[model samples]
Target: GSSGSSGPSKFIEGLRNEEATEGDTATLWCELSKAAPVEWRKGHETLRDGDRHSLRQDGSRCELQIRGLAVVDAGEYSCVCGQERTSATLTVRALPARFIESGPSSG
Candidate 1:
């Protein structure tokens, strides 16, 4: 006799927040110990059939790649597992480009 099992056991172990520029591309990986389907969404919209977001599968991991970062792209991202597992949230921050002007003529 054993206690009733809980909900979906799958989950994201850990992820890496790679640094990316405004015009550069960046990928956020959701590492899972086991194989599972994942869904990525921005705000309340699913990242599907869009130019900015893409959902890719790499072996046993789920990847979310965002291209051409924009100021409105900064927010919390969530990745759900297999439509059965719990959802994991990741915060993405995009920094704007900055330039420093010195002098028109150099000595």
Candidate 2:
């Protein structure tokens, strides 16, 4: 509830980096000290409402979701908030095939 105090917004929680595989992709989130404003970002490219990025916000919490995941899809992101903000990098991992190699051992 609004206590009628004009205090700048703060983060009750901060963003954290994640290691995600090539399926059921990224979902980054944070909570505000009190309900305020923020925007999703990916480095130099400012993210959108993400009808494509699939960004979601509810109450004091903001969530970013990507339906697709790949090696090229990982990067630094920020929840550029109205007050002090938070930033995190998403680490991507490829499929098992990429990491697995078949070799023959000669005894």
- TM-scores of all models? 0.62, 0.77
Off by over 4 Å in 2: 98-107
Q: Predict model 2's lDDT versus the native.
A: 0.76
TM-score result, candidate 1: 0.62
Write model 1 residue lDDT over 11-78, tens digit each, in one string: 55655444555566667776665665677777787787467677886656887888877556656666
Lowest-lDDT window of 10 residues in candidate 2? 98-107
Runs in model 1 lying further than 4 Å from the true structure: 1-9, 16-19, 83-107
Models, CA RMSD each: 6.4, 5.4
Q: Per-residue lDDT tens digits of candidate 2, residues 24-57?
A: 6688888876666678888887787645577767
